[PDB]
Structure 1
Amino acid sequence: NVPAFLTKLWTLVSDPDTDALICWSPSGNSFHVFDQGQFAKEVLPKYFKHNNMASFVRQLNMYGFRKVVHDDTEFQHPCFLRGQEQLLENIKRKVT
């Protein structure tokens, strides 16, 4: 029972067709968004029902992702990892 957000994110990051704007970091334990504006206008509304970077980022925080602090946005969750989709089962949406 893995939420759509996570399997879509995983597919989106992993897809080579989108790697110019969103791709795995070299060590495969975090991912990069490039050219936010382009990414928000062109990519997000193909996967989700919006075109707002801020809405995407909220979801990331809700699922426990943390920003990696350095137009290049990097995010990270330890059980969100290249080549290991089975680990998405351990990522939980934060309740209250």
Structure 2
Amino acid sequence: SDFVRKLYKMLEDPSYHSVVRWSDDGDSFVVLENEKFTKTILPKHFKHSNFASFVRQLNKYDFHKVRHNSPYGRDAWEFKHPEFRADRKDNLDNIRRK
């Protein structure tokens, strides 16, 4: 998948660490800030600067937002797909448009 491969490539660069990174477990990823992501990082990896079109694409590939009851950030967004993991770089094509 084109989008998925690019999502994983994004999460390789540590310069982004404080803004968008893998979670501690490595089984989900966290968008910690929004503005610098939306303005600086989204454009460089995807064809938009619109956080919500990013979100929309995630739901199309069956990623789900993980709901907090605070753990990562006040206004952080965490997304998780069962197959999308830091250690499973091989299994990316298994993630596909619902």
TM-score, normalisation: structure 2: 0.88
> How far 1:36 sits from its partner (Å)?
1.0
One-letter code aligned to 1:80: F
Where relative contact order (Cα < 8 A, 6+ residues apart) is larger, the structure is: 2
Q: 1:83 aligns with which of 83, 87, 95?
A: 87
One-letter code aligned to 1:48: F
Q: Aligned residues: percent identity?
A: 48
* Structure 2 contact 20–33 (Cα < 8 Å) conserved: no
> Distance between the aligned counterparts of 2:37 and 2:11, measured in 1?
12
> How far 1:11 sits from its partner (Å)?
1.0
* Deviation by residue 1:55-89 (Cα, 9 ceiling, x = unmatched): 00011000000000012100000100012111112
Question: Following TM superposition, where does structure 1 have runs of at least 4 consecutive aligned residues deviating by more than 4 angstroms?
Answer: none
CA RMSD of superposed structures (Å): 1.0
> Distance between the aligned counterparts of 1:92 and 1:49, measured in 2?
19
Pairwise mapping of residues 1-96 of structure 1 onto structure 2 (< 5 A)?
A: 3-70=1-68, 71-94=75-98
Q: Secondary structure of the equivalent of 1:75?
A: strand
> Distance between the aligned counterparts of 2:96 and 2:6, measured in 1?
15
Compare the two structures and name the one with the higher helix fraction: 1
TM-score, normalisation: structure 1: 0.90
